[PDB]
Amino acid sequence: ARGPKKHLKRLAAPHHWLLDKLSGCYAPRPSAGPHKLRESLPLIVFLRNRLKYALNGREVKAILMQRHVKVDGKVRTDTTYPAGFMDVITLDATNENFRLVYDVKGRFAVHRITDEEASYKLGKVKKVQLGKKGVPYVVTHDGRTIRYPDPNIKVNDTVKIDLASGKITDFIKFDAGKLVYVTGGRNLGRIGTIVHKERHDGGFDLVHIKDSLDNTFVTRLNNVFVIGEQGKPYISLPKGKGIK
Amino acid sequence: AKQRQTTKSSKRYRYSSFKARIDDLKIEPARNLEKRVHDYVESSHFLASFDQWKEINLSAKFTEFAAEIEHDVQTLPQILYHDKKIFNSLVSFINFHDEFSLQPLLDLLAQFCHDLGPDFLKFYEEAIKTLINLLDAAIEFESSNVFEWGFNCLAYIFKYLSKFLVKKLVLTCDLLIP
Amino acid sequence: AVTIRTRKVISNPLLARKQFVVDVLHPNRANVSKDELREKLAEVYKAEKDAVSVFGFRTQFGGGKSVGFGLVYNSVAEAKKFEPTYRLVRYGLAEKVEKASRQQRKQKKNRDKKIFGTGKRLAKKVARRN
């Protein structure tokens, strides 16, 4: 190709969207945004194929242009806006607040939350660096750049971000015994406590995770998301509690 | 400004400023000829509209309001016997000034007066005061829909209490001077 | 007699409507016209016939039953605002727009592409030339 692509075939689309293969020839291509293409749920799929509030794309466009949908406290009008993991979707008219968390099957689940829980989100600290004029900042998994962070915050820790102000309320270090959600691979969606972090210099680090049901599994560090202390997650978990 | 939107574009959806909606708006409920739910009644106007609004509106405040008053509006004698508590709850929730729940509450307030007209007179002073505060509150958050609901609620009350208010029209005027 | 039942009723304040699956049992009858169903769902939900739309009726094999989708808008204005244009045309709420076939419009578009500007100058030039 001679430039960026702008179409997506249905067969080429991510499996976990669960798109009918016979409905059409193309699937919604997520626009650029906080989350990568393959790890995102465009708003059209969420509003049409999950909540069923809209019966066709034009209805989704009409809903969005009414400004009834808020993503992380901000109004979005893009049909293919890439909502993703730990994203808060608010529909005031229906009095509904959703958090995008994968199920044990490995698909985004329609998980309803209260307003108090919807007031914040969690972000995995992807990077920590000094910006211009020597101002430290942290970049999270959702592309949020937050200045003046706590010095103790390091890579792979989890920061609780208040949506209204976009500031760090609290943080959780990456350490053994912490509660962890898997966001990648075949173990995607499982929940368990850390046991050990295998560190290989110049290679991918591996983390051993132990579920409540005593089963153990090993996953790459990139698919790990710390969500709280064992038995005390900082977010309401979906049905099944990431078991099996 | 000098010229209004006299010539309409081919667009199906067009932006309209809050002031633009207000100018076109006119308070005359009898002019509207859309079917009214309360025209069809089995027990009372309040229950007929109350059932409808439960199924359309899902706002946090209205759902809470329905739960408190659901048991006490099943039959017209129940409404009359429990008129005091129903009115206080209606006024209490309207005070929250939640736009997502005003439309059902305001509609029910008018229909509430419809069910027990002469007995609503003891509630007449408080209802008008609550509406006036709501409308004064309505100025700060611009929503032409809120004004339409509030004044239509005011118009409906006059329609149902036309006989009694007319005898003391000056008193009704005195309330609305502000 | 003929029976109608609405199931899977979902309230949609986003589009300001109620969406449901309509099941019509019509023994000893071929099938039921859409306009009658609109009238009658309107009577049921206590809304205008103009605010009620129905589509996707398929008679079950062997006859005697039909299944489809139905929408009831909170107000007729909302229905006019959100409904598809073609469905509005079906119910008479909107008038069919008369337009030329696709080939004719495309040929006109190409011809207009060939000409630059208003073209009155070209017209007067050719008039003078001939």
Binding site: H111, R112, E116, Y234, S236 | - | T3, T6, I10, K18, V44
Partner: peptide
């Protein structure tokens, strides 16, 4: 923290007959 409680459906089926 507990998740928000599911809301019983607001709308219910309804029926008539004619002719």
């Amino acid at each position: 923290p507990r998740a928000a409680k599911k809301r019983r459906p607001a709308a219910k089926g309804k029926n008539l007959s004619f002719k």
